[PDB]
Design a protein around this ligand. Structure first.
Ligand SMILES: Nc1ncnc2c1ncn2[C@@H]1O[C@H](CSCC[C@H](N)C(=O)O)[C@@H](O)[C@H]1O
Lengths: 265, 265
């Protein structure tokens, strides 16, 4: 009679919270989805072993189209768990799932876990300074999306930082690297000439947040465009004007050029 | 020879991640601070019992003024942990402590946990649509803070949601309620008269996120300003232009007036 939306956190099977794990262990059925994001530091087998329960994986279609036919029926007579990477309900379409639960007479509870939205605080950039967020999508066929470029422009114009999620093909298991994001942004700049993203733009790359050994790098595009940030997932941030404390952290922790202490503050 | 910044999460001692718990268990020394936020669902005793170690609680002055004299010395020849409510680097000035750690020759690692910054997802408002965030500070003496008013204005103007952290005087055990935040805002509106926050403004209140039964309410100020949202901590949100599904969630889950379902554009 109860559905639990439980977040798995950032990188591996240990990013789930104690509360999350204990609740998942008491559930009769456990579902999971890995299309909003993957867990690069673990496997379904490791998550299953940790929880001590078989996990049924659901596709985007299973969820978006049949959530009430696959999950809710079981949540009517049993305790059911729905696992997702990061913090539940952060993914745009997930909140609506609670409406479906209510409509079906199912109670639902949300057990939080670390999210990239808060984990980016490890870059040293002040969280309050982040503006609207966006996703960099691969152009395709006759479709060349560029809204994320405008997001950066409006945020930076107000001295705000921009968090950029990079495209991911869940099933195809392929992620857009920070390097590819930069190349794409450089292309959009040549098309819009807005002076928003260029070789001299300062950027921060965060890779494998959640891991005990994440990659945090800050610098100008011209110098980071071909650098190796390691395995995915990657997240790209275009900061707005920096507070001196943000700058110092980037230099001392993210190996940024001392030059940002005079150019970007 | 190591310092761990470990977040404890939102409500109780079980909001810590498994990773954080296992690491905190193997640490030689454990320090903590409870002035940056409130964990309404637990106590120091329960936390100590969970990790199996005594915790030396530090004041804001101990940290900001003597972190390098109290904590870092031990991290030189031992494994030390520094516990914090929510996520260690979110809406705090703790990031700078890693610089101090570095200059002292101490390696540091960050263990994330659920943060209110991403927990706002439970309000049904798309997290990518949040703009710059702000903190509503208690006026003091003749000094009356008002910058948060301009943040709301700037965001609303762009159609973005505004997250408002509420003030806290840990030593006085005083935690600002959403009601108090609304009163202050109406007062700033009278002063500035920018038509940014009035009795007809739609707002969302989130109290005790992290508990299994948080209070989530949405409605016009004139109706919520005197409503009881339960014990602290509270967070206030002034949404911008709503998507149909955001409105639907606010009505179905946060008990908002069915009239907001009819967006105006
Ligand atoms: N569980 C909770 N429910 C509602 N508001 C909360 C909350 N926890 C924190 N807050 C809000 O966040 C403010 C503290 S700012 C520090 C945030 C913390 N580092 C984190 O990552 O969560 C509190 O004053 C309150 O306004």
């Amino acid at each position: 009679m109860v559905l639990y939306f439980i977040g798995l956190g950032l990188y591996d099977e240990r990013d789930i919270t104690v509360k999350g794990l204990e609740i998942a262990k008491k559930c009769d059925y456990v579902f999971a989805e890995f299309y909003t994001s993957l867990m690069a530091g673990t496997t379904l087998g490791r998550i299953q072993k940790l929880i001590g329960k078989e996990i049924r994986v659901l596709s985007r279609e299973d969820v978006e189209l049949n959530f009430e036919n696959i999950v809710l029926p079981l949540a009517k007579e049993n305790d059911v768990a729905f696992l997702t990477p990061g913090d539940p309900l952060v993914a745009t379409t997930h909140a609506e799932l609670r409406i479906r639960a209510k409509r079906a007479g199912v109670e639902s509870y949300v057990i939080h876990a670390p999210s990239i939205y808060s984990a980016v605080g490890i870059t040293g950039l002040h969280i309050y300074k982040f503006g609207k967020s966006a996703t960099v999508a691969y152009p395709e066929g006759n479709w060349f999306p560029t809204s994320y470029y405008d997001v950066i422009k409006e945020n930076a114009e107000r001295g705000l930082h921009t968090l950029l999620f990079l495209d991911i093909k869940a099933e195809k298991r392929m992620y857009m690297t920070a390097n590819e994001a930069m190349e794409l942004l450089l292309k959009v700049e040549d098309m819009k000439k807005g002076g928003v993203f260029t070789d001299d733009t300062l950027v921060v790359v965060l890779a494998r947040a959640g891991s005990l050994n994440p990659t945090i790098r800050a610098g100008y595009v011209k110098d980071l465009i071909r650098e190796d940030f390691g395995d995915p997932p990657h997240i790209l941030i275009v900061p707005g004007k920096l507070h001196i404390v943000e700058a110092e952290y980037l230099v001392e922790i993210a190996g940024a050029p001392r030059e940002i202490l005079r150019v970007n503050v």
